[PDB]
mmCIF file of C-alpha atoms in Angstrom:
data_model
loop_
_atom_site.group_PDB
_atom_site.id
_atom_site.type_symbol
_atom_site.label_atom_id
_atom_site.label_comp_id
_atom_site.label_asym_id
_atom_site.label_seq_id
_atom_site.Cartn_x
_atom_site.Cartn_y
_atom_site.Cartn_z
ATOM 1 C CA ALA A 1 -40.123 0.320 11.176
ATOM 2 C CA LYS A 2 -41.410 3.681 12.645
ATOM 3 C CA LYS A 3 -39.502 3.071 15.953
ATOM 4 C CA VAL A 4 -36.971 5.831 14.938
ATOM 5 C CA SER A 5 -38.801 7.680 17.650
ATOM 6 C CA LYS A 6 -35.864 6.451 19.875
ATOM 7 C CA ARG A 7 -33.404 8.355 18.040
ATOM 8 C CA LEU A 8 -35.716 11.392 18.143
ATOM 9 C CA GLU A 9 -36.306 10.627 21.804
ATOM 10 C CA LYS A 10 -32.459 10.793 22.290
ATOM 11 C CA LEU A 11 -32.298 14.134 20.823
ATOM 12 C CA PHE A 12 -35.149 15.484 22.837
ATOM 13 C CA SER A 13 -33.630 13.787 25.986
ATOM 14 C CA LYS A 14 -31.549 17.010 26.374
ATOM 15 C CA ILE A 15 -34.589 19.341 26.475
ATOM 16 C CA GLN A 16 -36.350 16.855 28.880
ATOM 17 C CA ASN A 17 -33.822 17.220 31.631
ATOM 18 C CA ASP A 18 -34.196 20.878 31.669
ATOM 19 C CA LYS A 19 -34.370 21.087 35.397
#
């Protein structure tokens, strides 16, 4: 399963909301 992306997306979520 290469959907670990979710966990990665979780860590990047912080940078995403850099408004």
